[PDB]
Design a protein around this ligand. Structure first.
Ligand SMILES: C[C@]12CC[C@@H]3c4ccc(O)cc4CC[C@H]3[C@@H]1CC[C@@]2(O)/C=C/c1ccccc1C(F)(F)F
Ligand SMILES: C[C@]12CC[C@@H]3c4ccc(O)cc4CC[C@H]3[C@@H]1CC[C@@]2(O)/C=C/c1ccccc1C(F)(F)F
Lengths: 11, 242, 242, 11
């Protein structure tokens, strides 16, 4: 699961 | 490193990290319904989450953590953090909650929303408590950061222990910072420890409100009252509610 | 008014003297009905002792009967849990519900829905173990839970009610004084005292969280009709949706 | 609510 929160934490 | 910050430097960092106050999409052309009121509040909360993520990254010590651990802390604490911010903004508005500058609600205005009133009452009571204690902005930012680091720490092999120890060292620095602020403000040594405990004890009530608010949001989702954004759905799903 | 004049040492003595007894369970393979039976039969017997303990916590009987009910309704499961975590401190990986009922995670689960709560309780016991929590500190924290957990949901604005909240907060400050005095006696520096105070009070937020989860679990078990719950336990449970 | 109230009175 490509979690949105995980992605946002990198942007 | 966060561990080498002075108290004054810690406060400056937290203060500069503060997210913006966002406006609601409030539409005064039509009366509220349960669905429209929930839509406004969850749309607002969703936009705030993006800013919260960027705030957390600026909390000293948070980015030292693994991405998994950062996710875990934010998943655990996000509603507590939204609530403490709401209660802060509402301090100077007795009897009302300032969700946004263009969305200030009294307890009767959302009465159409099933299950709202218990939570509204608790949030109002917390804002009243902050007002009575004369909570300062420097203290508020310390407390909000404590919620971020503390709420999920207990639900975290060799690597795990160091992550935990790190969180605990940062929390200790924030304790030192709160005490320093109190001392600088003229509180006696006994008043310092009394106030520290009073402030930290409020965090128990914030946890309680968050747990109740999460169950409320879950009930709204499960009743198809409001469509939740993907991010909000994920934050909610992390709580594994029934 | 007697409560507010106690020394730190007298407060500890009073709290230690108030302590309830450690109760037993029933004297081969567990089922969901049988295990829930044992745990709820134990909780019910403990509640009777908890009431009598609460009456012995300095300041409690100064409050109206209405307010005593409210504090115990809010706090009872937190109080049961902190007692459980304390008894379990010296038994890594186990929960000592009673001396003849010690449960581990290695055991096959016999009750649905409780693994997360089990793991949170274990994590708390481990935190207490790591901090080397002392018995005198434990009794302070348990009394803080009784007085703190429900004070924010006294919403009454009459003069009598404000005086009642004032009194609870004056007693809480005395208990904070007592905890700091224990830490000073143990040789902690001022910085270490404030840090440990904060570490202990932050654990109460986790205990609140667990109580909230445990209350939902107990409710689900009631609805399943798996266990006959005592009349008192049902009313303590009913208080959390009333 | 009543049982708790009775027990708190009870001595
Ligand atoms: C989750 C929920 C909606 C979002 C709320 C919120 C939005 C933006 C913020 O900056 C802070 C918050 C804190 C509380 C959140 C709310 C808790 C339960 C909820 O589902 C809605 C509650 C609700 C609905 C209608 C009117 C009032 C409320 C109140 F007051 F309880 F929050
Ligand atoms: C409410 C519940 C059952 C009673 C439990 C209890 C009993 C006696 C005590 O001194 C303390 C406690 C604290 C935990 C209480 C429990 C929380 C959820 C519950 O419904 C049952 C949980 C449960 C069932 C089976 C095996 C373990 C657990 C555990 F560990 F999660 F508590």
């Amino acid at each position: 699961k490509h979690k949105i929160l995980h992605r946002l934490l990198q942007d | 490193l966060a561990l080498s910050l002075t108290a004054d430097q810690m406060v400056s960092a937290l203060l500069d990290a503060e997210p913006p106050i966002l406006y609601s999409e409030y539409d005064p052309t039509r009366p509220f319904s349960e669905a429209s009121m929930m839509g406004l509040l969850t749309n607002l909360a969703d936009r705030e989450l993006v800013h919260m993520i960027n705030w957390a990254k600026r909390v000293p010590g948070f980015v030292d953590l693994t991405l998994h651990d950062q996710v875990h802390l934010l998943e655990c604490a996000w509603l507590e953090i939204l609530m403490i911010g709401l209660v802060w903004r509402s301090m100077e508005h007795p009897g009302k909650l300032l969700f946004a500058p263009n969305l200030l609600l009294d307890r009767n205005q959302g009465k159409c929303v099933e299950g709202m009133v218990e939570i509204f009452d608790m949030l109002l009571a917390t804002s009243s408590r902050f007002r009575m204690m004369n909570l300062q902005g420097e203290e508020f930012v310390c407390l909000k950061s404590i919620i971020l680091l503390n709420s999920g720490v207990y639900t975290f092999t060799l690597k795990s222990l160091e992550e935990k120890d790190h969180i605990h060292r940062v929390l200790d620095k924030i304790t030192d910072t709160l005490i320093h602020l109190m001392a600088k403000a003229g509180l006696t040594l006994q008043q310092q420890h009394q106030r520290l405990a009073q402030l930290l004890l409020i965090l128990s009530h914030i946890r309680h409100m968050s747990n109740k608010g999460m169950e409320h949001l879950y009930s709204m989702k499960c009743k198809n009252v409001v469509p939740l954004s993907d991010l909000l759905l994920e934050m909610l799903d992390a709580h594994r509610l029934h």
